[PDB]
Amino acid sequence: TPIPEEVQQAQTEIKLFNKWSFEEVEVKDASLVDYVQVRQPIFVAHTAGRYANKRFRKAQCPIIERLTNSLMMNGRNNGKKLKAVRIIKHTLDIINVLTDQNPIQVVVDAITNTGPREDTTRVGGGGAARRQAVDVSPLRRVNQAIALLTIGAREAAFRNIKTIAETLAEELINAAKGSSTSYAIKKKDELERVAKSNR
């Protein structure tokens, strides 16, 4: 005889903190969508050493997993995962609360906007150093997107009287709505400015 966990007395049970659904989330960009896996996550975590393999579609990824991990990290020093998950658990809820839309969908929207079209590697050749503009490679767009969004959130927390979760929500929403106030979009638009020009 029961007692047990309270959820719904069931159906298919949506997990992802038990709060939100992943399947509804659309990646508009046809190119981008392929790399971004959301055919069947939750939020628990996991490593798996998928290996670098190149050219064709490389590995599995969860967007969320990447976002928590960047936060613990950047930065700099001395961040633990129990706090790092916690801040996101709350951040997702702040984001949902601001938008009235699925937090994963906003995360997607942020990342797709912040991920530039083109970049600007620095090559020495002959007697001088040129930038000819360089590939984006679809995971690297994603990685850069998250990193940029993540530095911005940190920068705000440090400077202003705000906990991370809100700085992270704010920076993400702002990117997710195409406003230059976010660090992440401002750098995207710069990086694509420089890459187009330097050709």
Partner: protein, 85 residues
């Protein structure tokens, strides 16, 4: 330094922010744009202190005008209103 105000508790005690102005303007006015907003986002936008927003939320809670939920870092969400369900 630059300087420096909202600043609490002494402003909290005196009438100027506690009475009406802060609870009605800041907390209550924000809510019609977003049904819920987090206690900490709400701190930062309003420019109101975390401690300062916290008692105001609590008065409002008693009233039944707002309803909080929780989380440990005295973060949570703040909601006003809501319904027929």
């Amino acid at each position: 330094k630059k300087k420096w105000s909202k600043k609490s508790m002494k402003d909290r005690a005196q009438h100027a922010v506690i009475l009406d102005q802060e609870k009605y303007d800041r907390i209550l006015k924000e809510v019609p744009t977003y049904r819920y907003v987090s206690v900490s986002v709400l701190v930062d936008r309003l420019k109101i202190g975390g401690s300062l927003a916290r008692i105001a939320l609590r008065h409002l809670e008693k009233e039944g005008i707002i309803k909080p939920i929780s989380k440990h870092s005295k973060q949570a969400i703040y909601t006003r209103a809501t319904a027929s369900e």
